[PDB]
Design a protein around this ligand. Sequence first.
Ligand code: VO4
Ligand code: VO4
Ligand code: VO4
Ligand code: NA
Length: 129
Amino acid sequence: KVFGRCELAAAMKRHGLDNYRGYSLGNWVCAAKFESNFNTQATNRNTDGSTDYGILQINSRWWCNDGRTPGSRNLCNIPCSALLSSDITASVNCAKKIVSDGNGMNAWVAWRNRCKGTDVQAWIRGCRL
Ligand code: VO4
Ligand code: VO4
Ligand code: VO4
Ligand code: NA
């Protein structure tokens, strides 16, 4: 599914990401924009052989099992394919574990380089929610 901006903002707020560990909803929307272009089906292979999955590009090196990332962890206790669903529940629940692990949203390279320190409220401007 390719979400609209406000449709994804509403879904993320319903799943408890608004101000989760102090990150406003616009941070999560901005991160999803630059990680996946709001596409739940997005996949991208990393140089080290891991893959990033779904709307928030969650990495098989640590967080999910994709059957082909040797010596990796599955800290969200999910198959990586769960992260590609039209239903963002699995991605949000796993993202809450990632952002809680000590590095905050710096785990998301696109958030650090494109969202951090910008006017992220712009991402939810005009949205009903
Ligand atoms: O892309 V690599 O060590 O898995 O983060
Ligand atoms: O109700 V689903 O969040 O598991 O749309
Ligand atoms: O999941 V992202 O680390 O590719 O920036
Ligand atoms: Na893994």
